[PDB]
Design a protein around this ligand. Structure first.
Ligand code: ADA
Length: 300
């Protein structure tokens, strides 16, 4: 039995290679009983589409960002907040530990079973027309965001105007002037070709929202207890493999887009951004559940 697993990214991308590795491990560990087959390039739909398919049992697995789950699984908000993670190592400690496992389990009420997290670096704003040197340069800018209430709030808090849309629609939106900007990590900015539409990469590092690898709960529940354990272990084993590929890809991608003429822009005073964005903590992570998760993250 091969689980069909979706990804928006190309076949060579670290998140796709990681799930392929999970598939190899799972096939071996299960003596051929279980496996994974990956469907890259967004063939099976946008990330929101694949959430819908998992919910109804029409798709077995997806590798998506945690952000489009914000509206479905409130606990994922804690991972996506601005400046909630100090750095990569902080994030990895949190996600690998009990807090990460708790948020994966909290998906079950939505008909989803979280299996593992993959890294997504830090997201930064890239613009078409001009550099962003400070908070003021974002005023009134049309900035694409993922389909998340939190993210709409995050961009509004920067004095800019959010347009939620699926990843695959972003390139043409930048090229045709529908939006002025979007935001993402280095490998996405490269692989999407957004760097060819928006040549200013302004290092804001305003979120470290990670990826999640998720199974349809309906499919999960057809598995034996023992098969479930194998599936989890294969998924977890693929995380360090993903990270080795990812950290290398961040460097390769930055080098490539600089070679293509991208202007890498420094924002001198990030504290401006931290203070501007802080209100979303109470607006979106202010209830008992979320505020507790946020505290425990900060304390790691
Ligand atoms: O901005 C987006 O939609 C995308 O950002 C990253 O590329 C992430 O890896 C994708 O899963 C998706 O979330």
């Amino acid at each position: 039995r091969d689980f069909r697993s979706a990804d928006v990214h190309p076949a060579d991308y670290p998140t796709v290679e990681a799930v392929k590795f999970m598939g190899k491990q799972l096939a071996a560990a299960s003596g051929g009983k279980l496996g994974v087959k990956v469907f890259p390039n967004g063939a099976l739909g946008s990330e929101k589409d694949t959430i819908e398919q998992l919910k109804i049992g029409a798709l077995d697995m997806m590798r998506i960002n945690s952000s489009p789950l914000n509206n479905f699984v409130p606990e994922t908000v804690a991972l996506c907040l601005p400046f909630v993670f100090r750095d990569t190592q902080h994030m990895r400690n949190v996600l690998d530990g009990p807090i990460g496992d708790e948020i994966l389990a909290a998906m079950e009420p939505a008909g989803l079973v979280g299996l593992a997290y993959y890294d997504s670096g830090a997201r930064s704003i890239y613009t078409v027309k001009a550099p962003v040197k400070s908070l003021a340069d974002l005023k009134g800018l049309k900035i694409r965001v993922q389909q998340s209430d939190l993210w709409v709030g995050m961009i509004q808090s920067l004095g800019a105007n959010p347009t939620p849309m699926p990843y695959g629609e972003v390139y043409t939106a930048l090229k045709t002037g529908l939006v002025d900007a979007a935001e993402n990590n280095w490998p996405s900015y490269e692989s999407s070709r957004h760097f060819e539409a928006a040549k200013f990469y302004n290092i804001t590092e305003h979120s470290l929202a990670p990826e999640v690898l998720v199974m349809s709960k309906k499919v999960w529940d057809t598995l034996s207890k023992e098969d479930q354990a194998l599936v989890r272990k294969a998924a977890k084993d693929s995380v360090p493999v993903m990270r080795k590929l990812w950290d290398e890809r961040e460097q390769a991608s930055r080098k490539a887009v600089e070679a293509a003429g991208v202007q890498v822009v420094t924002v001198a005073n990030k504290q401006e951004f931290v203070d501007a964005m802080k209100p979303v903590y109470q607006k979106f992570a202010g209830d008992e559940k979320l505020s507790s998760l946020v505290k425990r993250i900060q304390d790691t």
